[PDB]
Structure 1
Amino acid sequence: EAPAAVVTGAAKRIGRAIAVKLHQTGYRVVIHYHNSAEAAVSLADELNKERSNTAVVCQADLTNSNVLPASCEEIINSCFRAFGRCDVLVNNASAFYPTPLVQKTVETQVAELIGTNAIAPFLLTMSFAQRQTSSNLSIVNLCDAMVDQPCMAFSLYNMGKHALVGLTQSAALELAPYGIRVNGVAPGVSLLPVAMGEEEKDKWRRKVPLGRREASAEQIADAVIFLVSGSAQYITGSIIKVDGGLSLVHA
């Protein structure tokens, strides 16, 4: 049978491009969403028109809470229910906003920023592993090429992305005996935030050495496709920067 993948935050932007490219590669896909039901279903409709019964949607809030472990177990379960297997987990869903150190409650911001970017990937990783040859099992975490030169006033976001690097490495070591590889893709500037102004976006584009433009979502997805492929069978614990050289540029 075809392998199956879960992509979190898959209704739009980078997660959608990842789901599309996995599907084009021959995967059946679980399209996870929180608020974007109409977009999730629109994508599933598009993929199922290409190949019947090869895409399902799955709703969950990935904010940390007392119920997050059960939510994460249910996302993994949805893949096994639809497809009978779950070969690939892509932890793409992410909250992103500033949290100044000097003046939503701060503890809500913790639950969102550290929940979506680190704790939910951790719980999904546990559930994915618990449910596990010619198999090619792997997890890809969407990281951030600027983790070591962070945006001003983004402490909690940066802490969450750092925690995700730690998860990538710890899980790669711990799951290697099961043949599960765990890797990351770290975009620099890709699709800019919808809310961001045009002038601010051009400011970011101009800093990129390679072509003075942001990565398309498809360019990010290309690195994910490589890491889940048979061409990456010895690669685990690696984080591939896809940033056009941005992280190499000094202040």
Structure 2
Amino acid sequence: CPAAVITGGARRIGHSIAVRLHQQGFRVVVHYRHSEGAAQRLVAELNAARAGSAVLCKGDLSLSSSLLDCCEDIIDCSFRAFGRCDVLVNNASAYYPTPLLPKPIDAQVAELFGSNAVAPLFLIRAFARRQNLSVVNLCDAMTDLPLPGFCVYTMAKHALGGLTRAAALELAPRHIRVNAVAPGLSLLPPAMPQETQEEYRRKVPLGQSEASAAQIADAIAFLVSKDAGYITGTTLKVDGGLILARA
């Protein structure tokens, strides 16, 4: 049985990824930072389906003196619990505005660049050094049309895109595939008022609806499968045509 590590796999999309992989024979490591309770409910639920098929792992992925070691332990966790790690899904991501013109800015680049870019880099490094192996990074189809006010987040995601291709090429000799899935509009913020959410959905050309977590899980499932054995360094966009819409 192959093992997979899902960062931020406690809720939403990450939760759907952890479940999907598990439904396919994967033993999963569910990482989280604060959604400890949601994490436990998922792990328990998975082990109830298959004893010893799911473990928990807590860790902050922000830039810090402890980030490099934290990433080392998160991967080490897969080996301690399952003796192996075949799949890494970089789903954990900090997301909020940081307007150029008027929490500290320094602390923002630390949390935004850490979770969306640097942690993934440290995780892949650790994953590759301890070795159907594949990595799947979660990108954002919309970063090409920068969301006003999310400057730092945009840079972070662009950097992650550079990591997907840079890693893809260096790990090819090691037979490790590195790809990405780029959602456009998926699960909306839970606090966001319905009328606002409805103004967002109406923008999606294909069905005027956001992508469900399961549809995103589907794409990831395809990329980790043997049906994508020749695919590496590619980004799979899942945005219902949203990026194609003219302003």
TM-score, normalised relative to structure 1 = 0.98
- 2:164 aligned with 1:165, yes or no? no
Instruction: Tell me how far apart the structure 1 counterparts of residues 119 and 194 of structure 2 sit (CA, whole Å).
Output: 32
| Partner residue in 2 for 1:201 | 197
Instruction: Tell me how far apart the structure 2 counterparts of residues 199 and 159 of structure 1 sit (CA, whole Å).
Output: 30
Shift in Å, 1:64: 0.9
Instruction: Tell me how far apart the structure 1 counterparts of residues 100 and 195 of structure 2 sit (CA, whole Å).
Output: 26
| Partner residue in 1 for 2:30 | 31
Give the number of aligned pairs: 247
Shift in Å, 1:197: 1.9
Alignment of 1:96-245 (within 5 A): 96-132=95-131, 136-245=132-241
Shift in Å, 1:104: 1.1
Alignment of 1:63-82 (within 5 A): 63-82=62-81
Instruction: Tell me how far apart the structure 1 counterparts of residues 195 and 125 of structure 2 sit (CA, whole Å).
Output: 42
Percent identity between the two aligned chains? 63
| Partner residue in 1 for 2:39 | 40
Shift in Å, 1:195: 2.3
- Greater than 4 Å deviation, 4+ residue runs: none
TM-score, normalised relative to structure 2 = 0.99
Alignment of 1:1-20 (within 5 A): 2-20=1-19
Deviations 1:14-57 (A, max 9, x none): 00000000000110000000001100000001100111000000
Contiguous gaps of at least 5 residues in structure 1: none
Instruction: Tell me how far apart the structure 1 counterparts of residues 96 and 195 of structure 2 sit (CA, whole Å).
Output: 19
SS at match of 2:143: coil
Over aligned residues, Cα RMSD in angstroms? 0.5
